Amino acid sequence: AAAYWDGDYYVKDDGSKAQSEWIFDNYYKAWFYINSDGRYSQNEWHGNYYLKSGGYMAQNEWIYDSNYKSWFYLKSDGAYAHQEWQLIGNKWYYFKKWGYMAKSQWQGSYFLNGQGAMIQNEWLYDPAYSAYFYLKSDGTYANQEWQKVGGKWYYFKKWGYMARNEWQGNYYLTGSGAMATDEVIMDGARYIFAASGELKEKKDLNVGWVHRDGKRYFFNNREEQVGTEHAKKIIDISEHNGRINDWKKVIDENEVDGVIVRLGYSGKEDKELAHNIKELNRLGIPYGVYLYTYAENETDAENDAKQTIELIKKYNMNLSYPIYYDVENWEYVNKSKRAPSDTDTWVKIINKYMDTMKQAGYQNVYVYSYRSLLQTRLKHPDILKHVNWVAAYTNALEWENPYYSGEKGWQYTSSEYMKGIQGRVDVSVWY
Numbered sequence: 001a002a003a004y005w006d007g008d009y010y011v012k013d014d015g016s017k018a019q020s021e022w023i024f025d026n027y028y029k030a031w032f033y034i035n036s037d038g039r040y041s042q043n044e045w046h047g048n049y050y051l052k053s054g055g056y057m058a059q060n061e062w063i064y065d066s067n068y069k070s071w072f073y074l075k076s077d078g079a080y081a082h083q084e085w086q087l088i089g090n091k092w093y094y095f096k097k098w099g100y101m102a103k104s105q106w107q108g109s110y111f112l113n114g115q116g117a118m119i120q121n122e123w124l125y126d127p128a129y130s131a132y133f134y135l136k137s138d139g140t141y142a143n144q145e146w147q148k149v150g151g152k153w154y155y156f157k158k159w160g161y162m163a164r165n166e167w168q169g170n171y172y173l174t175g176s177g178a179m180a181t182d183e184v185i186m187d188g189a190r191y192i193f194a195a196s197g198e199l200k201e202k203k204d205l206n207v208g209w210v211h212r213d214g215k216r217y218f219f220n221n222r223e224e225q226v227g228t229e230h231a232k233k234i235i236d237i238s239e240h241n242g243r244i245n246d247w248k249k250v251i252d253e254n255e256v257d258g259v260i261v262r263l264g265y266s267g268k269e270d271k272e273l274a275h276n277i278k279e280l281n282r283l284g285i286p287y288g289v290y291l292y293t294y295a296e297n298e299t300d301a302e303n304d305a306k307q308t309i310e311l312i313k314k315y316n317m318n319l320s321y322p323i324y325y326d327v328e329n330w331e332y333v334n335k336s337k338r339a340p341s342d343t344d345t346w347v348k349i350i351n352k353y354m355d356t357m358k359q360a361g362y363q364n365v366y367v368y369s370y371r372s373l374l375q376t377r378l379k380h381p382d383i384l385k386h387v388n389w390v391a392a393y394t395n396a397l398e399w400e401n402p403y404y405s406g407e408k409g410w411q412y413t414s415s416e417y418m419k420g421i422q423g424r425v426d427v428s429v430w431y
């Protein structure tokens with residue numbers, strides 16, 4: 001025996017201490033870097049190599065470096081992988097310049113997940129491109145082709161963008177991207193598809209707001225009249241519609257009878273509320289208001305009512321339509337919290353909001369929600385008695401409420417285009 005460790009120092013085959021050099025220890029079967037001070041490197045990098053705790057050079061292994069806040073992979077010769085792909089534990093990883101593992105990002109036509117692994121047979125919504133992509137079996141994005149995914153057909157355009165609300169040859173991609181296999185009503189027409197997706201027939205329809213025999217009516221997509229000649233066209237607006245440049249233009253050109261204006265959501269005022277109220281008041285356009293709730297309990301509900309009342313007085317609101325508690329299956333952007341799923345909690349929440357508003361002197365207060373929620377979570381006599389504005393973007397509402405009787409609204413669309421407004425608009429028929 002000749003060469004040996006002496007504390008932090010290494011004595012070579014001769015009598016001399018190692019200095020500024022790599023040594024291979026046959027006992028450990030490992031490489032070590034000895035520094036200019038004669039001591040082994042550990043828990044640190046030397047050029048392309050990482051020396052682990054105790055000095056051992058990393059080889060064929062992952063290292064997480066807390067200083068760089070990144071994973072690195074040391075190859076068979078110990079050098080860090082960089083600007084290259086590596087197959088490790090039967091998954092593909094990509095290493096960027098300086099060895100940083102790619103994560104939650106594209107590398108050309110491939111996408112690396114939060115763990116660094118190349119994704120395969122997976123949907124990806126990328127906010128950076130504002131669209132859906134599908135990573136195929138080989139990891140590359142679907143491109144200028146059909147893919148059958150989860151038992152349904154989707155079409156991918158140039159650069160991988162999932163087709164939606166559009167045609168591809170004889171096939172129509174619906175809003176979810178899924179190929180139409182039934183019927184689609186659009187363009188004032190009914191499109192009938194084979195179960196296999198090819199268009200079979202188009203039939204023109206009597207639908208929407210129609211002026212007929214000297215009067216105006218609303219027809220649902222089943223070609224059924226909703227209400228009478230006095231049916232009203234009500235839009236609902238928020239900061240999400242942007243700044244409305246010319247309110248009078250919107251009203252006249254689109255024959256709009258009234259507006260429900262977003263107050264905001266629990267704890268925050270809508271950015272366009274001040275402007276919208278100023279203009280609607282100035283022009284004497286009839287309006288009501290709504291608040292999107294993130295309530296979890298009666299305390300939140302009371303706070304919602306307090307907020308509502310504060311805003312009404314602040315902006316001198318003149319309410320021709322009701323105050324609406326907009327109740328949906330809410331979820332925090334960060335997913336930390338979501339709406340209570342039980343009916344009894346919502347009975348408490350909704351009635352606390354109503355009671356608080358009523359005690360404050362506001363007697364024209366109702367609930368808005370979606371048909372699906374009203375059939376399930378919100379299906380209770382003490383909730384339904386307050387519901388007179390229902391959303392269902394369907395061919396007919398086909399929903400009865402035994403607990404409310406009187407004037408009511410059906411929000412039949414969130415995709416209408418109107419003169420004087422940028423982008424899509426929510427519209428209701430009031431009857």
Ligand SMILES: C[N+](C)(C)CCO
Pocket residue numbers: 005028040054055056
């Ligand atoms: C491997 N060293 C000898 C350098 C340290 C472990 O005792």
Ligand SMILES: C[N+](C)(C)CCO
Pocket residue numbers: 022031049057077078079
């Ligand atoms: C090159 N080293 C000596 C640093 C180790 C094995 O490649």
Ligand SMILES: C[N+](C)(C)CCO
Pocket residue numbers: 045046047048068072080098099100
């Ligand atoms: C691996 N890094 C390049 C990030 C540091 C070592 O030189």
Ligand SMILES: C[N+](C)(C)CCO
Pocket residue numbers: 062071101115116
């Ligand atoms: C170590 N990674 C998390 C980077 C990949 C292996 O699961």
Ligand SMILES: C[N+](C)(C)CCO
Pocket residue numbers: 085092110118138139
């Ligand atoms: C290594 N690549 C990612 C380029 C191909 C594996 O499918």
Ligand SMILES: C[N+](C)(C)CCO
Pocket residue numbers: 106107108109110129133141159160
């Ligand atoms: C999928 N895109 C082509 C749009 C970007 C990533 O390569």
Ligand SMILES: C[N+](C)(C)CCO
Pocket residue numbers: 123132162175176177
């Ligand atoms: C594209 N998906 C099928 C994942 C849903 C779209 O909303």
Ligand SMILES: [Cl-]
Pocket residue numbers: 048079080081082
């Ligand atoms: Cl390297």
Ligand SMILES: [Cl-]
Pocket residue numbers: 370371372373391392393
């Ligand atoms: Cl619904």
